[PDB]
């Protein structure tokens, strides 16, 4: 029975040591920790990027604006946040767990964190003075607090999100524009549930499908529709206006998320920025 | 009877649960899935960045231009594509699987996806009007369809790869430049094979190495040579020019890949952008 | 006897083919290489980003300025290094194992690699002509070789690190500015040790926290203090000057690391850039 004791240890560990052979080990065989350290990218290694002074944790001031050290999302989110050629002025994204966030003009603003049932839900900042109005035919996503941009009316305790778009192709000189809007209660608010989709079926997407079909086949562009998964929200579109719905946003108006692309073809870039901005 | 049964499962799975000690387990020890789910960053976690509404897959429109979710790749490729300080005008990279791609001027246009044997291989777009001609001691890589920038002669069923370079350093006011053009058939085309190398031996590097020797000893620069692994390729490197072989690209000229840097000293980033752009 | 050899294989090999089932296998269940090949993003895949022509290793020139393939390290570091707004002129960071590095004006220059006891400790370059004076009410980190920026005196065989800051908030019109300085020998030099912290206790932080506390309510800002882990280090923090200590630096003055943000609120990006720039 003592043979069982020794032969049992063969299960616990491997006689093999780490090395180049670990790369060439056949796929069917099992692995030890040392080899798995080599083969797969370790969570330590990503944590090792910002590690200084061999501290147990990375610097607090760094963890604030790096999504608590999630470097992978931080890199891609950073460029789309600002520096894109086609984005007008500076896209405004209020990331959670932050002291300051830039506004449309570019001044960093102390963020008013809204607390829901003793839990911080989201924060907003003053819009500031927009550099320029949104000129060309492009799409954009807008999220504001206690305000409706189309109606210019304030609803206390309610968050309204607007999506604007240009149906016509940028090359096509014909001008057709529409938008989708909805108001969400403060309580059941989750950034994850909202997205811009071209495949998932929703009421906004249905409107865009036939609305583009209204235009000539040469100038058609694939529909991009607002989708909201949260209970208690109704998405309302608009008829084909043919003129841009929103040109500028007042500074006094509270702001949560706002991003517009000069051309419509890079509409999906907006959704990517929204996806990266808030962790689910 | 049951002693074999239990002892097999005893070895087969792990009794230990995940925790802090999971990090401190011996390297030679073997591990469970929950342990590996902690130690290494997962496919899901990388996939989790773009996940919305807990959907099985990422959004289609985001899936198109993010290399089908290669967020690790997408971030680095993005800045080199747009916003490089030394890059002139807008370098053009045509990403596969996408409807639109920006041209030199910055106006995004529809892509003509070439299909070979009922299988797509590459896409090209109109060059557009260049913002400014390339005027400095710099190097660039150029890929065009059905055309030869050296001879300005149209091709049929042929894709020509051109690589200009700056023999002198930035400080060396002495002016001398060379190039290495190649033409490849569509049938044998494969992006991954071609690269810019300073160590791998090739015909272009063979000439390029001696060319800097013609320079004064103080003026030497590290050779950078075009290398093509595609069988049936012809590589030609002309003598020193003393002037820029190419100044501007005609708008009607078809384009696939084009990028140039004012300073030759950053020629390496050109290869990186080409490496990032196309998945092997 | 045969059972022992037979049952050993059951230990070493899972005998289960990879698939979606492997994705859904229980966490307690042990797994083979094929699962870890799937479950975790491999070191191979990160190598695959720059992989080309199926070469056993990545290109030399590409690996030189990409931290030898640390793509994610290269990604986030790239945008912060240059191209971001709220950065005066160009941030200058000299990466190790490099031929050229950009100056303040943006022209890349040869790097004098300082080798100590037959080990290359660091490298420095000529500062070049600064584009503009260092704006207003911002913070920055400065590292110079054989020099003292505040004292403008040469110290052979000693490297000095300087930190500047603005106590007052950008919104507050009141003006209060302080700084921290240290002189480090080259022999004990190690990049990873030094950092900007808001939680770790250090002499520089202790001097600064009461200083901003001396400011009236509503004007106080989170203290960010120099912390140096290298033994034999002195840190000095003067009284609140009320005016910017430094505006421009001479071109002839050697420069190791230099970064400055127009707004103080983005102090973290300064530490973030330093953390990314040099591997531990």
Residue numbers in the entry:
A (entry chain B), B (entry chain A), C (entry chain C): 4 to 283
What did the article's authors report about this structure?
Banna virus (BAV) is the prototype Seadornavirus, a class of reoviruses for which there has been little structural study. The spikes protruding from the outer capsid shell are heterohexamers composed of a VP4 trimer capped by a VP9 trimer.
The C5 reconstruction focusing on vertices of full particles revealed only low-resolution density for VP9, except the N-terminal fragment containing one α-helix, reflecting structural variations in the head domains of the VP9 trimer relative to the N-terminal α-helices. Residues from the unfurling domain (D71, S74, and D78) and the pedestal domain (K466, D499, T500, N502, E503, Q525, and K565) of VP4 form hydrogen bonds with residues from the tripod to anchor the VP9 trimer onto the VP4 trimer. A density map of the VP9 trimer at an overall resolution of 3.8 Å was obtained by iterative 3D classifications and subpopulation averaging of the VP9 density at multiple positions, allowing us to resolve an atomic model for almost full-length VP9 (covering residues 4–283). The VP9 stalk adopts a helix–loop–helix–loop–helix conformation, and multiple residues are involved in interprotomer interactions. The extended loops connecting helices α1 and α2 serve as the internal hinge for tilting of the C-terminal parts of VP9 trimers. Considering the large number of VP9 trimers on the BAV particles, the structural plasticity of loops in the stalk region of VP9 may facilitate the interactions of rigid head domains with multiple receptor molecules on host cells with variable binding orientations. The viral infection is initiated by VP9, which recognizes and attaches to unknown cellular receptors in a multivalent-binding manner.
